């Protein structure tokens, strides 16, 4: 079956669009009129009020659209609308670091329906965006390489549909937790894949199987750089109890959305923070996430680590290969930025049983005490551990060792750290020394050596 539309072309229910294991139903997308894709523009000139534009010279012309700066489109997913605060919330953070034409793509006319129908409606939206991009090219000589499309869930695939139609000439697409159902395992024609854009980077935050786990996003690797923060399955701060998720620091509405799909929504929450935290999301190349947490993928390789999020395009080898997997941990609440360190403590003093903690002091500040090890603390033995600090301390000037245990020995033992080596993510090492020992719960201050 085939239905054709002016401006957008034809749409058919031929394989693989329908009639396959992942998409059996023969559904055709709704009419352009019904989906009603709207382009809402925000700019540094107009940061709080959107100018609704469209693919026509009078619109672009009458509006704040400046042809000399990048253009970033943001496409939402199922049930949402382009007026959702999270979308404009991204532009506003972009205005903090660059001059840009921020375009929110609304298609609630087609997203607030049955999912199988929303999945098909995705192709009209992609079509609408490629039409708008080709228009900017023809009308203003504007290059689609200045174009960046960000898409959340279903929008990740609408962004991939918009790239198919422009033959991968668009600068980049960022898939924020691409929806899984009706897309995972299917052909590239039907979903986001590295070929839709000159560069495609993806943030995976809810990759558990849709059944039975109900993970809304895909585990399958779909871009050039695929990031799996926190492992990409369960996000910290998500599993709070019901009353706490709903009554969270951002109001009921945010809380409710999070009660419904916390992990899934973490992808745009992460991306928004990276914008204003350019080094806060170093992702590490690694076999898998278990090898990462096993302390086997540190520090960054030569040339560096890609920053997950906004600055991922600054990475030198971004398109060297497709589906490159990176891992990293974030915070459980806003300012999700974390800086990973590694410390190696060599023990001194008496053999005891307890937990050893360390805190870092540098030019930019100090951190919390992080547990490095717990169990038998035997002398001259060395223990290492990597951890994600909520602060960047800069150049290290001091490290304070400390231990304790639930059972206090009647001998009053003293444990020390003869040497502690801190190694930063870019591979910088600082050495600290101490000949002293301390009773439990007393900070042992180590100095540069």
């Amino acid at each position: 079956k085939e239905v054709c539309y002016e401006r957008l072309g034809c749409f058919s229910d031929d394989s693989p669009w329908s009639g396959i294991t992942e998409r059996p139903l023969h559904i055709l997308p709704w009419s352009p009129k019904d989906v009603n894709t709207r382009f809402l523009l925000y700019t540094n000139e107009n940061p709080n009020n959107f100018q609704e534009v469209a693919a026509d010279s009078s619109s672009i012309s009458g509006s704040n659209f400046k042809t000399n700066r990048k253009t970033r489109f943001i496409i939402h997913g199922f049930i949402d609308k382009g007026e959702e605060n999270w979308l404009a919330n991204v532009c506003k953070n972009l205005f903090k670091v660059e001059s840009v034409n921020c375009i929110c793509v609304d298609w609630k006319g087609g997203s607030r329906t049955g999912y199988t129908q929303a999945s098909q409606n995705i192709r009209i939206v992609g079509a609408e965006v490629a039409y708008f991009v080709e228009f900017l090219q023809s009308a203003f000589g504007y290059s689609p390489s200045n174009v960046h499309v960000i898409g959340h869930s279903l929008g990740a695939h609408a962004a991939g549909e918009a790239g198919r139609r422009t033959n991968g000439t668009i600068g980049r697409i960022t898939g924020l937790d691409p929806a899984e159902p009706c897309f995972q395992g299917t052909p590239e024609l039907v979903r986001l894949d590295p070929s839709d854009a000159k560069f495609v980077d993806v943030i995976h935050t809810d990759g558990a199987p849709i059944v039975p786990n109900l993970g809304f996003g895909m585990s399958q690797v779909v871009g050039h750089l695929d990031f799996f923060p926190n492992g990409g399955v369960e996000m910290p701060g998500c599993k709070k109890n019901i009353l706490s998720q709903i009554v969270d620091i951002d109001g009921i509405w945010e809380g409710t959305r999070d009660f419904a799909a916390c992990n899934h929504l973490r992808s745009y929450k992460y991306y928004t923070d990276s914008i204003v935290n350019p080094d806060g999301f170093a992702g590490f190349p690694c076999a898998s996430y278990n090898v990462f947490t096993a302390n086997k993928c540190f520090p960054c390789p030569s040339g560096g680590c890609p920053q997950m999020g906004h600055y991922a395009d600054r990475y030198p080898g971004k398109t060297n290969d497709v589906g490159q997997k990176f891992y990293l941990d974030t915070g459980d609440a806003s300012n999700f930025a974390r800086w990973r360190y590694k410390v190696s403590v060599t023990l001194s003093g008496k053999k005891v049983t307890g937990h050893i903690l360390v805190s870092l002091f540098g030019n930019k500040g100090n951190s919390k005490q992080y547990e490095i090890f717990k169990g038998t603390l035997k002398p001259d033995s060395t223990h290492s551990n990597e951890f994600d600090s909520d602060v960047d301390v800069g150049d290290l000037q001091m490290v304070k060792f400390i231990w304790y245990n639930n059972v206090i020995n009647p001998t009053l033992p003293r444990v020390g750290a003869s040497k502690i080596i801190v190694e930063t993510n870019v591979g910088k090492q600082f050495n600290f020394c101490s000949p002293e020992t301390v009773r439990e719960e007393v900070l042992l201050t180590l100095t540069p050596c």
């Binding site: 009554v247 919390k368 201050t445």
Partner: protein, 85 residues
Amino acid sequence: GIIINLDEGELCLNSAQCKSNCCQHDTILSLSRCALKARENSECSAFTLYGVYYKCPCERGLTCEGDKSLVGSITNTNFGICHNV
């Protein structure tokens, strides 16, 4: 409420419920959730009897230095900064 071993950001009525022993809230008329104890050189509060804090007590081996008053105790305002010794 009546639920122990809570995580940071989870609502609480009393510090006993929080893994980090600090149920905290910024103002008097506002909900309190579990928060991490104050790291060195940042603001803290002297251990209290009210169960919740406006600022958290310091981490291990640290002393919250500041003016400790009789009024400050009944008012839960015995503020200071976390210092090594």
